[model samples]
Target: LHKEPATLIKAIDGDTLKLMYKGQPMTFRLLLVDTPETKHPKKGVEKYGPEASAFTKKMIENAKKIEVEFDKGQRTDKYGRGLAYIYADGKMVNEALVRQGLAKVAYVYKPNNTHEQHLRKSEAQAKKEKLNIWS
Candidate 1:
């Protein structure tokens, strides 16, 4: 996704990030994918959550630049966080997460199903290989 160039402020978790968008800070939850919860005050960390978070952090850290592409289906979630497909270091960040078994296919809302099929295929491969969270 290379629509509008944005700087990654910080990765909140596997599927969420804080980014500098158009001179303002915005939160983006990766579209068509979901990762384990690494930060919940009361719910505590879910299994593989730490690994998921670390994966995302390292991915962002290693990237030379970051960019976000909003889906043609839907733009934002109910929480107002921008929904996007993130690109970093020339790789599709969201797809990478799924391929690595660090995240799962999660079509949270209708019309925002941009890369659902690809993500699901990657997730299946990860599961079959028994990788990371899938293990």
Candidate 2:
């Protein structure tokens, strides 16, 4: 997997974002991190979903640079959202979300387990600390 620079267009949810990749707009879903559902036509907003979304928005706003690293197995989800490891200020956005306890490590796909161990450790610590959503 390689990283591609992108411009932040908007935050769709906690782990999902709208980005301009190479000047084209696309939806990017944070790989290996699942935040609470913020927007669902049927389900509406889930608990902690708003909190997670706000956290992500703040992160993006303060980021110096934004890049996307695509997974090897699948690039897009069933909803046509691009799956990626988002980087902001040289750090993985996915890991940040988990570390902050706003999200959980999940939906791991093979061959793209690049930051699996690091993310897992962060998740464990977040859980132990009972931070945010973990509380």
lDDT of each: 0.86, 0.88
Q: Which parts of model 1 have CA positions greater than 4 angstroms off? A: none
> Which residue pairs does candidate 2 place in steric collision?
none
Candidate 2 lDDT over residue span 10-116, tens digit each: 99889889999988899988888889996777789988899889988998889989989887787888999888998888888899889999898997778767789
Q: How many backbone clashes does candidate 1 have?
A: 0
Considering every candidate listed, which one attains the maximal lDDT? Answer: 2
Clash statistics: count for each candidate: 0, 0
Predicted structure with the largest TM-score when compared to the true one: 1
Alpha-carbon runs more than 4 Å astray in model 2: 41-43
What tens digits encode model 1's per-residue C-alpha lDDT throughout 4-87?
889878889888999999999999988888789978787899888998899888988888888888887768878999989988
Model 1 error, position 45 (Å)? 0.6
